[PDB]
Design a protein around this ligand. Structure first.
Ligand code: DGD
Ligand code: CLA
Ligand code: CLA
Ligand code: CLA
Ligand code: CLA
Ligand code: CLA
Ligand code: CLA
Ligand code: BCR
Ligand code: BCR
Ligand code: BCR
Ligand code: LMT
Ligand code: HTG
Ligand code: CA
Ligand code: CL
Ligand code: CL
Ligand code: CL
Ligand code: FE2
Lengths: 341, 137, 81, 334, 38, 451
C-alpha cells in the first residue's frame, strides 16, 4: 500500500465515468482529437494546402467542413507544432495542416487508450476481453487507412481528410484511381459489413418475435427482469421457424453470438488488408485476359470495361483540382468524353 | 480581391463610353438574370443552342455588336440571330414578345440595364467559367 | 449509483439556473465576439472574403516547399499588398 | 375430409421440413423460374444491347466473362418500360439480343421475394409467434424493389435497372453517383449509418454476450458445448455484461433490458436500410443529393472550392464518360 | 409463341387461384390458439 | 383518468393512441381533430402559396402544389393556363382555414370533454368493432359520402365552369364537359390495361370526357355500394376470411392507402392530363422528348435533313423507329416514345412522327414549348438547385412532379410497412399470442421434430 497502489485505488474508483490507468492515455488524446476536429472544422482553412475552404467561418456547412491533410510538399512530416516547418507558430501550423497530423496521431493513441480501457474494465469486472478483441477491427481500419495508406503514397496529402464530403471524395478517388470496388478484399469487407447488419437485424427481430409472454402488458418490454434466470425468448421456436423458412437455423446461442462477433470483425480486417495493398498502388485494377481480348476485338464489351471508362473520366476530370501540387493543365481537346456530354 | 468600381465599369456603347454600375445594380442584375434568363443561360452558356454563349468576345463579334450596354438592352427588346439577319422575338424572350414570354412583362428599362450589366461584369469576375460550360466547373 | 448527484436534481434546481443563466450566455457571447471582432481570422490564419486572392491574381497560394513553407505563406500574405 | 381440404392442410402444415403455405404456393414456382433462367443466362446468354444502340454487352461466362465481370444484362433501352415476355419476341434469338432474360428473372424474383416476406408472416402465425420478422425483412426487400423496379419506372426504362452481376452493380453505383450525387443525399447517409451501425452493434452484442458466457466447460473443449439447445436458463450473465458496458461508457448509455436491447438491434439497421431504399426510390424521380457546387464565393466573386466541388469534378468524369455513344443532345435528362 | 403464352397464362391462373382460394379456406382458424375467429 | 397509463391500459406512452381502441368518443375526438389538421394545412398552405405567387411566372417555378390543383379544376385560369384571377385560390384557402377551426373545435371537445364512450350515450353513434352489421353500416355512410364527392367533381366539370383542358383544340383552355364517357367498355377498359410501357393502366387516361364519366361511374358505384353495406351484413365466406377488429380494419385501410399512394406517385409522374404540364411542369418523358424536338428544330434550321441523318451508332441522330415501327425521336429518349403531349401531337401522323410535318409545319409556339419543357425537366437537388447533379448553383428549381412523386412514394412505402405491422399484430391478437408465447403451452413443443 505505497503510492503506486494508492494511485491505483483512486484510478479504479467506481464513479460515473470510469478512469483507470488506461484513462491517462485515453482521455487527453480522445479529447484533443475531438477538439482538434471541432476547432479545425469551425475556424480553420485549407486554402494553402488544397486551395479549399473548409470551415464554418468560411461558409462551409456540416457536410462540407473538414480538417484537411497537409500540402503534398510536406511529405510525411509529423508536422509537430515545434517542428522545423511551423517552428512554434500556431497560426502557420494551422495553415500548413498541423491539425491533420495532430488529430490523426492523438486519435491513434486515443484508440489504443480505448482498447486498453476495454481490457482494463473487463479485467476489473471479471469478464472475458472479447469486446477489446472485437475492437481490433476498428484499429486495423484506422491504421491502414489513415496511417499506412498515406505512408505508402507520396505524402499525408493523399490520406483521407476529416470531413463528410472530404471522405466522399476519398471514396470516389479510390474508385477512379484504384478500381477499389473490384478488389476482393474490399468485397470481403462489404460482405462482413452487410452481413453484420443483416445479423443485427435478424437476431434482434427474431428475439423480439419469439418472446415468452412474461407479463400482461401489450407493450412487452417491462415483462423482463435483468436478474431473471430464464431465457426471455424461445430458442426452440426460433430454430424451428428459421429451419422451415430458410432451411437452416442457429441452435446454439453461444455459437450465434460468437458468429455475430466474427462476421463484421473479419470483414473489416480484410478491407484493411486491401487498403494496405493500395498504399503501394498494388491494386486489383484489371483482368489481363479482359484487356487482351478487348484490345484485339473492338466489339467485345463487358461491365468491367465500362467501369474502366468511368474511372478514366474520374481521373482526368478530377485530377487538376484534386491534385493542385501537380499543376495539371489538361486542354479541352484531351479530356475524355462520350458523345454530346 | 473585391468587387471594385473598376470591375463594375463596363462599355455603355460602341463609341468608347463606359458606365459604372453600383453594387446594388450588380445584385439587381444577378437577381433579374436568374429570374428571366438563367433557365437557359446559367453560367453564360445557352442550353437550347450551346454554339452561342454570353462571353464578351462572342457578343463583340455579334451583329450588331452586343458587348456593351446598348447592345444588350436592344437585344432584350428585339433579339436577332448572330448575324443580325433575323428577328427572333417569337422564340426568344424580349419586351417585344412579353405577351408570349410573360416573365418579361414586369421588366423595366432599369431592369434591362441591370441584366445587361450582369452579363458584362460576370466574365470579369469568373473568367473562362463564364461561357465555359462543365469543363470549367 | 456512483455517488454524484443525479442530473435530474441539478438541472431542475434553482441555484443551477442562477449560475448558468449567467455562465452559458457569457460563453455564447464570448464566442460570438471571437467571430465579430475578427479575432478568429487572425488566430487561425483564415482568409477573410477579400483575402483569398489579390485583385488580379487567380493562382492559389499553394505551399510547395516543406522547410520554408512558413516564409512561403508569409510572402503569399504580403502579396495581398 | 375432401381432397381440397387435405391439400390445404398439407400446404399449411406446420410439420413440413420447409414450410409451404399459400404465399409459398406463389413463391416456389416464381423463385424456381427466376433461379433457372438466371443460372442458364449467366452461363450461356449471348451479348445484350442494354442501351438500345446496337452495342451488345457480353454478360455470360461462355462469352468472355468471369464471376466478377459477368452479369445478366438489363433489357434494351428501345423497350423502355414495355412488357417484354418471351412470347412478344419473334424468336428466342431476338429475345436474347434484347435482354428478355433480365425482365423474366427480376419480375419472377420480385414476386417470389414478396411472397417470401408474406410467408415469414404466415409461418410466424402457424407457430404462435409474434408477427414482425417479416417487417425486418421488408428493408432488404424494399431495396431490391428500389433498384430493380422503382428506379427503372422513374427513369423510363428497365435498361437502367441494376444489372444482375458484380461489376454490373458497381456500374449502377457509379452512374448513380454521377447523376444523383447520392453520397450527398441524407437518406443514403442514413443507410450508411444503418449498415455501419448494424455492423458495429453486431460486433458489440456478439462480443458482450460472448464475454459474459457462464463457465460450463473445461479449457480443452469448445465453450459452445456449455449451451444446450432448449435449455431454459440463459447462457450468459447479462448483469455482468451490462456492468462492463455501462462502465465502458457510462451506466445509462447501456441496456439493462434484453428486450429493449434486441429491439434496438432490430430497429437501427432496419430503419437505416428503409431510408437507403427510399433514397434510391426518390432519386428515382430525380430529387437528388445536396448540391453545394460553387456555394462558397469570395468578396470579388471568385469561386472558392470546397470538398463538394471536388466531388463535383469526379461526378463530371463519370457523367461525361458513361454510355459514351448513347447521347446525341447536351443534357442527359434520363 | 402463342402456345407458350397460353400455357403460361393457364399456369399463372392455376397458381393464383390456389393462393386466393387457399386464403379463403378458413385461414384465421389455422393457428395454434384461438380458432373461432369468424 | 381512464386508461391513461401503462398499468391500466397495457400500452406504453409511445403506443398511447392504442389506449383509444375501445373508447369510441375519445377516438371520435382524435379523428375529427386530425381531419381538422388536414383541412388546416390545406387552407394555410394555400394562403402561403398565394402570398408567394407571381402570376406571370409559371406555377412550377414557384414551388406550388395546391394552386395547381385548384387551377386544374378550371378556377382562376384562362387559355394556356394563364392566371386571370387569383381570387378563387384565396377563397379555397380561406374557406378551408375557417373550416379547420370548426373541425378542431369538435375534435377537441370529443377528445377531452365529451362522453369517452358513445355506446351508453347513443346506439346510433356508438359501435362495437365486432358488430359486423354496424361496421358495414358506417362503411356505407362513408361510401355514400365519397360517391357524393366524385359527383361534386362531375358537377364542377359539367355545370359550374368545367375543367382545365390541356388538350383543348387551339390550345389549352377551360372547357365545359358536355358529353362525358358513359360506355363501360371504355371506363373499365382502362382498369383492364397493362401497367407496363405504352399502356400505363388508369394512369394513361388522356381526355377529360373519360375522367368525368369515370367519376360518374365511381359516384354511382360508391353510393349503391354504401346503401348495400347499410342494408346488409357480411356473408359467411367473408366472415370466415377476415379478422374482425379495430386494428385489423386499420390494417386493411393502410394497405389500401399504400396502394393509392403508389398509384398517385405514378399518376403525377406520367400523366399530363389531370396534372397539366402548364401548372405542374413537364413530365420527365416530356422534357426528354422536348430536348430531342429542340435540337431537331435547331439543326434543321441550319440546313440538316433530320430524316436521313445517321447518328454515331447507326441509328437516326434525330429520328428512328420504335420496336413496332412508328417514327420516334432518336437518342436516349427512344425510351420515352409513348409520351403524348399537345405540343408534339400536331407533328404526329399515322406511322408516328411525320417527316413532312416536321419539315414544314413546326410552329414557333412549338419551338417555345419544347425549349421551356426541355429547360424545366424534373431534375434537381434536395436544396432545390435545378438541373443535373453536376450543375452549378444559379437556378432555384425542383419540379412539383418530383416533390409530389417522391413524397407520395415515401408515404406509400411507410404505409405498406404499417399495413404489415398492424395486419400481423391483428392476427396475433385475435388468435391471442400477441404478447408472446405461453411457456407452459409452447406450440412448437407439441409438434413433431422436423428431423
Ligand atoms: C392487391 C395488390 C396485388 C398486386 C399483385 C401484382 C399485380 C401486378 C402489379 C404490377 C406492379 C408494377 C408493374 C409495373 C408498374 C409500372 O410500370 O408503373 C407505371 C404505370 C404508368 O405507366 C406509364 O403510363 C404512361 C401513360 O401516359 C400516357 O398518357 C398520358 C395522358 O396524360 C400522357 O399523355 C403520357 O405522356 C402518355 O405516355 C405511359 O403508358 C408509359 O409508357 C407507362 O410506363 O403506373 C401504373 O400503371 C399504376 C401504378 C402502379 C404502382 C407502381 C408499383 C409500385 C410498387 C412498389 C412496391 C414496393 C414494395 C416493397 C416491399 C417491401
Ligand atoms: C498522454 C497523453 C498524450 C499523448 C500520448 C500525446 C502525444 C502527442 N502529442 Mg499531445 N498533448 C497532450 C497529451 C498527449 N499528447 C496534452 C495534455 C496537451 C495540452 C498541453 C497536448 C498538446 C499537444 C500539442 C500542441 C502537440 C502535441 C503533439 C503530440 C505528438 C508529438 C508529441 C511528442 O513528440 O512528445 C515528445 C515528448 C515526449 C515523448 C515525452 C517523453 C519524455 C521522457 C519519457 C522523459 C525524459 C524527459 C527529460 C528528463 C527532459 C529533458 C529536457 C532537456 C533535454 C531540455 C504526440 C502524438 C504534437 C502534434 O500532434 O503534432 C502534429 C503537437 O504539436 N500535443
Ligand atoms: C394527431 C395527433 C394526435 C391526436 C388527435 C391524439 C389524441 C388523443 N391522444 Mg394521443 N398521442 C399522440 C398524437 C395524438 N393524440 C402522439 C404523437 C403521442 C406520442 C407523444 C400520443 C401519446 C398518447 C398517450 C400516452 C395518450 C394519448 C391519449 C390521447 C387522447 C386523450 C388526450 C387527453 O386526454 O389529454 C389531455 C390533454 C390536455 C388536457 C392538454 C390539452 C390538449 C388539447 C387537446 C390541446 C388543444 C390545442 C388546440 C390548439 C386547441 C384549439 C381550440 C380551438 C379549436 C377553439 C386523445 C383522443 C390518451 C388516451 O388514449 O386516453 C384514453 C393517452 O393516455 N396520446
Ligand atoms: C392512419 C394511419 C395509422 C393509425 C391510425 C395508426 C395507429 C396506431 N399505430 Mg400504427 N403505423 C402506421 C400508421 C397508423 N398507425 C404507419 C404508416 C407505420 C409505419 C411506420 C405504423 C407503425 C406502427 C408501429 C411500429 C406501432 C404502431 C402503433 C399504433 C397504435 C399506437 C400509435 C401511437 O400512439 O403512437 C404514438 C406516436 C408517436 C410515438 C410519434 C412517432 C414519431 C414519428 C415516427 C416521427 C415521424 C417524423 C415526422 C413525420 C417528420 C419529422 C417531424 C419532426 C422534425 C418534428 C395506434 C393504434 C403501435 C402499436 O402497435 O399499437 C397496437 C406500435 O408499436 N404503428
Ligand atoms: C405531400 C407533402 C408535401 C410536398 C410534396 C410538399 C412540397 C413542397 N413544399 Mg410543402 N409543406 C408540407 C407538405 C408538402 N410539401 C407540410 C407537411 C408543411 C408544414 C411543415 C409544408 C409547409 C411548407 C412551407 C412553409 C414551404 C413549403 C415548400 C414546398 C416546396 C419546396 C419543398 C422543399 O424544399 O422541401 C425541403 C425538404 C425537406 C425539408 C425534407 C423533408 C424530409 C422528411 C422530414 C423525411 C420524413 C420521412 C418520414 C415521413 C419519416 C418517418 C419515420 C420512420 C421511422 C417511419 C415543395 C413544392 C416551400 C415553398 O416553395 O413554398 C412555395 C416553402 O416555403 N412547404
Ligand atoms: C364528423 C364526425 C362527427 C360525429 C360522428 C359526431 C357525433 C356526435 N357529436 Mg360531434 N362534433 C363534430 C363532429 C362529429 N360529431 C364537429 C365537426 C363539431 C364542431 C361543431 C362537433 C361538436 C359537438 C358538440 C358541442 C356536441 C357534439 C355531440 C355529438 C353526439 C351527438 C350528435 C347529435 O345528436 O347531433 C344531431 C344531428 C344533427 C343536429 C344534424 C347535424 C347537421 C349537420 C351538421 C349538417 C352538415 C352535414 C354535412 C355532411 C357536414 C359535412 C362536413 C364535412 C365537409 C367536414 C354524437 C356522438 C354532442 C354530444 O356529444 O353530447 C354528449 C354535443 O354536445 N358534437
Ligand atoms: C371502401 C370500399 C369498400 C370496402 C372496404 C368494402 C368491404 C366489403 N365488401 Mg363491399 N362494395 C363496395 C365497397 C367496399 N366494400 C362498393 C363500392 C360496392 C358496389 C360495387 C360493393 C359491393 C359489394 C358486394 C356485392 C359484396 C361486398 C362485400 C364486402 C365484404 C367482403 C368483400 C371482400 O371479401 O373483399 C375482398 C375482395 C375479393 C375477395 C375479390 C376477389 C379477389 C381478387 C383476387 C381481387 C383482385 C383485385 C386486384 C388486386 C385489383 C387491381 C385492379 C383490378 C381492376 C384489376 C367487405 C366487408 C361482400 C359482402 O359480404 O356483402 C355483405 C359482398 O357480397 N361489397
Ligand atoms: C486543437 C488544439 C487544442 C485543443 C483545443 C480543444 C480541446 C478544443 C475543444 C473544442 C470543443 C470541445 C468544441 C465543441 C464544439 C461543439 C459544437 C460546435 C456543437 C454543435 C452541435 C450541434 C450543431 C448539434 C447538432 C444536432 C445534432 C448533432 C443531432 C441532434 C440535433 C441537432 C441538429 C441539434 C490545444 C489547445 C490543446 C492545442 C492546440 C491544438
Ligand atoms: C386531441 C389531442 C391533440 C390534438 C389536437 C388537435 C390536433 C387539435 C387541432 C386543432 C385545430 C385543427 C385547430 C384549428 C384552428 C384554426 C383556427 C383558429 C383558424 C382561424 C383562422 C383565422 C382567424 C383566419 C384569419 C384570416 C382571414 C379570415 C383572412 C385571411 C388572412 C387570415 C389568415 C389572417 C394532441 C396531439 C395535442 C394531444 C392531446 C390530444
Ligand atoms: C374515376 C376514373 C376512372 C375510373 C375508375 C374506376 C372505375 C375504378 C374502379 C376501380 C375498382 C373496381 C377497384 C377494385 C379494387 C379491388 C381490390 C383492391 C381488391 C382487393 C382484394 C383483396 C385485398 C382480397 C384479399 C384476400 C384474398 C386475395 C384471398 C382471401 C383473403 C383476402 C380477402 C384477404 C377512369 C380510370 C375511367 C378515368 C379516371 C377517372
Ligand atoms: C380470381 C378471383 C377469385 C375470386 C373468388 C371470390 C369468391 C367469393 C366467395 C368465396 C366462397 C368461399 O368458399 C370457401 O371455400 C370452401 C367451400 O367448400 C371452404 O373450404 C374450407 O372450409 C374450411 C374452413 O375452416 C377449411 O378448414 C377447409 O380446408 C376447406 O374445406 C371455405 O371455408 C369457404 O369459405
Ligand atoms: C512503476 C511503479 C514503480 C514502483 S516503485 C516502488 O514504490 C514503493 C512505494 O510505492 C517503494 O516502497 C518501493 O521501494 C519502490 O520500488
Ligand atoms: Ca350494415
Ligand atoms: Cl467557343
Ligand atoms: Cl456506363
Ligand atoms: Cl440523347
Ligand atoms: Fe442476443
Amino acid at each position: 500500500r505505497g503510492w503506486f497502489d494508492i494511485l491505483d485505488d483512486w484510478l479504479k474508483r467506481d464513479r460515473f465515468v470510469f478512469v483507470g490507468w488506461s484513462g491517462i492515455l485515453l482521455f487527453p488524446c480522445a479529447y484533443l482529437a475531438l477538439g482538434g476536429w471541432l476547432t479545425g472544422t469551425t475556424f480553420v482553412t485549407s486554402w494553402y494546402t488544397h486551395g479549399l475552404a473548409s470551415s464554418y467561418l468560411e461558409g462551409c456547412n456540416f457536410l462540407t467542413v473538414a480538417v484537411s491533410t497537409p500540402a503534398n510538399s510536406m511529405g510525411h512530416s509529423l508536422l509537430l507544432l515545434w517542428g522545423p516547418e511551423a517552428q512554434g507558430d500556431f497560426t502557420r501550423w494551422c495553415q500548413l495542416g498541423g491539425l491533420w497530423t495532430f488529430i490523426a496521431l492523438h486519435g491513434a493513441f486515443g484508440l489504443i487508450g480505448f482498447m486498453l480501457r476495454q481490457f482494463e474494465i473487463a479485467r476489473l469486472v471479471g469478464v472475458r476481453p472479447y469486446n477489446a478483441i472485437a475492437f481490433s477491427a476498428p484499429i486495423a481500419v484506422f491504421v491502414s487507412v489513415f496511417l499506412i495508406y498515406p505512408l505508402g503514397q507520396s505524402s499525408w496529402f493523399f490520406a483521407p481528410s476529416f470531413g463528410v464530403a472530404a471522405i466522399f471524395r476519398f471514396l470516389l478517388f479510390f474508385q477512379g484511381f484504384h478500381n477499389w470496388t473490384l478488389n476482393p478484399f474490399h468485397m470481403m469487407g462489404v460482405a462482413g459489413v452487410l452481413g453484420g447488419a443483416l445479423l443485427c437485424a435478424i437476431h434482434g427481430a427474431t428475439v423480439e418475435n419469439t418472446l415468452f409472454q412474461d407479463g400482461e402488458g401489450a407493450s412487452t418490454f417491462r415483462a423482463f427482469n435483468p436478474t431473471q434466470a430464464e431465457e426471455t425468448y424461445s430458442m426452440v421456436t426460433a430454430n424451428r421457424f428459421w429451419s422451415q423458412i430458410f432451411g437452416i437455423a442457429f441452435s446454439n446461442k453461444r455459437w450465434l453470438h460468437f458468429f455475430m462477433l466474427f462476421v463484421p470483425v473479419t470483414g473489416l480486417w480484410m478491407s484493411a488488408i486491401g487498403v494496405v495493398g493500395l498504399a503501394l498502388n498494388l491494386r486489383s485494377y484489371d483482368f489481363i485476359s479482359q484487356e487482351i481480348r478487348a484490345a484485339e476485338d473492338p466489339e467485345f464489351e463487358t461491365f468491367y470495361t465500362k467501369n474502366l471508362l468511368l474511372n478514366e473520366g474520374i481521373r482526368a476530370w478530377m485530377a487538376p483540382q484534386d491534385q493542385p501540387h501537380e499543376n495539371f493543365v489538361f486542354p479541352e481537346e484531351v479530356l475524355p468524353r462520350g458523345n454530346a456530354l | 480581391a473585391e468587387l471594385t468600381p473598376e470591375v463594375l465599369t463596363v462599355p455603355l456603347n460602341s463609341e468608347g463610353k463606359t458606365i459604372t454600375l453600383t453594387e446594388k445594380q450588380y445584385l439587381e442584375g444577378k437577381r433579374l438574370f436568374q429570374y428571366a434568363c438563367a433557365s437557359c443561360h446559367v453560367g453564360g452558356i445557352t442550353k437550347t443552342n450551346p454554339s452561342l454563349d454570353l462571353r464578351t468576345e462572342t457578343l463583340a463579334l455579334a451583329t450588331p455588336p452586343r458587348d456593351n450596354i446598348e447592345g444588350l438592352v436592344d437585344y432584350m427588346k428585339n433579339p436577332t440571330t448572330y448575324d443580325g439577319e433575323q428577328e427572333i422575338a417569337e422564340v426568344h424572350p424580349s419586351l417585344r414578345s412579353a405577351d408570349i414570354f410573360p416573365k418579361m412583362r414586369n421588366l423595366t428599362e432599369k431592369d434591362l440595364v441591370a441584366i445587361a450589366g450582369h452579363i458584362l461584369v460576370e466574365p470579369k469576375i469568373l473568367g473562362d467559367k463564364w461561357g465555359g460550360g462543365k469543363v470549367y466547373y | 449509483t456512483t455517488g454524484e448527484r443525479p442530473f435530474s436534481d441539478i438541472i431542475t434546481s434553482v441555484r443551477y439556473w442562477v449560475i448558468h443563466s449567467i455562465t452559458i450566455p457569457a460563453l455564447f457571447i464570448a464566442g460570438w465576439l471571437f467571430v465579430s471582432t475578427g479575432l478568429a481570422y487572425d488566430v487561425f490564419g483564415t482568409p477573410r472574403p477579400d483575402s483569398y486572392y489579390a485583385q488580379e491574381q487567380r493562382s492559389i497560394p499553394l505551399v510547395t516547399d516543406r522547410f520554408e513553407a512558413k516564409q512561403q505563406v508569409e510572402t503569399f500574405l504580403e502579396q495581398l499588398k | 375430409a375432401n381432397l381440397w381440404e387435405r391439400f390445404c392442410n398439407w400446404v399449411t402444415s406446420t410439420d413440413n421440413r420447409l414450410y409451404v403455405g399459400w404465399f409459398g404456393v406463389i413463391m416456389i414456382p416464381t423463385l424456381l423460374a427466376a433461379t433457372i433462367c438466371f443460372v442458364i443466362a449467366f452461363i450461356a446468354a449471348p451479348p445484350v444491347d442494354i442501351d438500345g444502340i446496337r452495342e451488345p454487352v457480353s454478360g455470360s461466362l461462355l462469352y468472355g466473362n468471369n464471376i466478377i465481370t459477368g452479369a445478366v444484362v438489363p433489357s434494351s433501352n428501345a423497350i423502355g418500360l414495355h412488357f417484354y415476355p418471351i412470347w412478344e419476341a419473334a424468336s428466342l434469338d431476338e429475345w436474347l439480343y434484347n435482354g428478355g432474360p433480365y425482365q423474366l428473372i427480376i419480375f419472377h424474383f420480385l414476386l417470389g421475394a414478396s411472397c417470401y416476406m408474406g410467408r415469414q408472416w404466415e409461418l410466424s402465425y402457424r407457430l404462435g409467434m409474434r408477427p414482425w420478422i417479416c417487417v425486418a425483412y421488408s428493408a432488404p426487400l424494399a431495396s431490391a424493389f428500389a433498384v430493380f423496379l422503382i428506379y427503372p419506372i422513374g427513369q423510363g426504362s428497365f435498361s437502367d435497372g441494376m444489372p444482375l452481376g458484380i461489376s454490373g452493380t458497381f456500374n449502377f453505383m457509379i452512374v448513380f453517383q454521377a447523376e444523383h450525387n447520392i453520397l450527398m443525399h441524407p437518406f443514403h447517409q442514413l443507410g450508411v449509418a444503418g449498415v455501419f451501425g448494424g455492423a458495429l452493434f453486431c460486433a458489440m452484442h456478439g462480443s458482450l454476450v460472448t464475454s459474459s458466457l457462464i463457465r460450463e466447460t473445461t479449457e480443452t473443449e469448445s465453450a459452445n458445448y456449455g449451451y444446450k439447445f432448449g435449455q431454459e436458463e440463459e447462457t450468459y450473465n447479462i448483469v455482468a455484461a451490462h456492468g462492463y458496458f455501462g462502465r465502458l461508457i457510462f451506466q445509462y448509455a447501456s441496456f439493462n433490458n434484453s428486450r429493449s436491447l434486441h429491439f434496438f438491434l432490430a430497429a437501427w439497421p432496419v430503419v437505416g436500410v428503409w431510408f437507403a431504399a427510399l433514397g434510391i426510390s426518390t432519386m428515382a424521380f430525380n430529387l437528388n443529393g445536396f448540391n453545394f457546387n460553387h456555394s462558397v464565393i469570395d468578396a470579388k466573386g471568385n469561386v472558392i472550392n470546397t470538398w463538394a466541388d471536388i466531388i463535383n469534378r469526379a461526378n463530371l468524369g463519370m457523367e461525361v464518360m458513361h454510355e459514351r455513344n448513347a447521347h446525341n443532345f447536351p443534357l442527359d435528362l434520363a | 409463341m402463342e402456345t407458350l403464352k397460353i400455357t403460361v397464362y393457364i399456369v399463372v391462373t392455376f397458381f393464383v387461384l390456389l393462393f386466393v382460394f387457399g386464403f379463403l379456406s378458413g385461414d384465421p382458424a389455422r393457428n395454434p390458439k384461438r380458432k373461432d375467429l369468424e | 383518468a381512464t386508461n391513461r397509463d401503462q398499468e391500466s391500459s397495457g400500452f406504453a406512452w409511445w403506443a398511447g393512441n392504442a389506449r383509444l381502441i375501445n373508447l369510441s368518443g375519445k377516438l371520435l375526438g382524435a379523428h375529427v381533430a386530425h381531419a381538422g389538421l388536414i383541412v388546416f394545412w390545406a387552407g394555410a398552405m394555400t394562403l402561403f402559396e398565394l402570398a408567394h405567387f407571381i402570376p406571370e411566372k409559371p406555377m412550377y417555378e414557384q414551388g406550388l402544389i395546391l394552386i395547381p390543383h385548384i387551377a386544374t379544376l378550371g378556377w382562376g385560369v384562362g387559355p394556356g393556363g394563364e392566371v386571370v384571377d387569383t381570387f378563387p385560390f384565396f377563397v379555397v384557402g380561406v374557406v378551408h382555414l375557417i373550416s379547420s377551426a370548426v373541425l378542431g373545435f369538435g375534435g377537441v371537445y370529443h377528445a377531452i370533454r365529451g362522453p369517452e364512450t358513445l355506446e351508453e350515450y347513443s346506439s346510433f353513434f356508438g359501435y362495437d368493432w365486432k358488430d359486423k352489421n354496424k361496421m358495414t353500416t358506417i362503411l356505407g355512410f362513408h361510401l355514400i359520402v365519397l360517391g357524393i364527392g366524385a359527383l361534386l367533381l362531375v358537377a364542377k366539370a359539367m355545370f359550374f365552369g368545367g375543367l382545365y383542358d390541356t388538350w383543348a383544340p387551339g390550345g389549352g383552355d377551360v372547357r365545359v364537359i358536355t358529353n362525358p364517357t358513359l360506355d363501360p367498355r371504355v371506363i373499365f377498359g382502362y382498369l383492364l390495361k397493362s401497367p407496363f410501357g405504352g399502356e400505363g393502366w388508369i394512369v394513361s387516361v388522356n381526355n377529360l370526357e373519360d375522367v368525368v364519366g369515370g367519376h360518374i361511374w365511381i359516384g354511382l358505384i360508391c353510393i349503391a355500394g354504401g346503401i348495400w353495406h347499410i342494408l346488409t351484413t357480411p356473408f359467411g365466406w367473408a366472415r370466415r376470411a377476415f379478422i374482425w377488429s379495430g386494428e385489423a380494419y386499420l390494417s386493411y385501410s393502410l394497405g389500401a392507402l399504400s396502394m393509392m399512394g403508389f398509384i398517385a406517385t405514378c399518376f403525377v409522374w406520367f400523366n399530363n392530363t389531370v396534372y397539366p404540364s402548364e401548372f405542374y411542369g413537364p413530365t420527365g418523358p416530356e422534357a426528354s422528348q422536348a430536348q430531342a424536338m429542340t435540337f431537331l428544330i435547331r439543326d434543321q434550321k441550319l440546313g440538316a435533313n433530320v430524316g436521313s441523318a445517321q447518328g454515331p451508332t447507326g441509328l437516326g441522330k434525330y429520328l428512328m423507329r420504335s420496336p413496332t415501327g412508328e417514327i420516334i425521336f432518336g437518342g436516349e429518349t427512344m425510351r420515352f416514345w409513348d409520351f403524348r403531349g399537345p405540343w408534339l401531337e400536331p407533328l404526329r401522323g399515322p406511322n408516328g412522327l411525320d417527316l413532312n410535318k416536321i419539315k414544314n409545319d413546326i410552329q414557333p409556339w412549338q419551338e417555345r414549348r419544347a425549349a421551356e419543357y426541355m429547360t424545366h425537366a424534373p431534375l434537381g437537388s434536395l436544396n432545390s438547385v435545378g438541373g443535373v447533379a453536376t450543375e452549378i448553383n444559379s437556378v432555384n428549381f425542383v419540379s412539383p412532379r418530383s416533390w409530389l412523386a417522391t413524397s407520395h412514394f415515401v408515404l406509400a412505402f411507410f404505409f405498406l410497412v404499417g399495413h404489415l405491422w398492424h395486419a400481423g399484430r391483428a392476427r396475433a391478437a385475435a388468435a391471442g399470442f400477441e404478447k408472446g408465447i405461453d411457456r407452459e403451452s409452447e406450440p412448437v413443443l407439441s409438434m413433431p421434430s422436423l428431423d
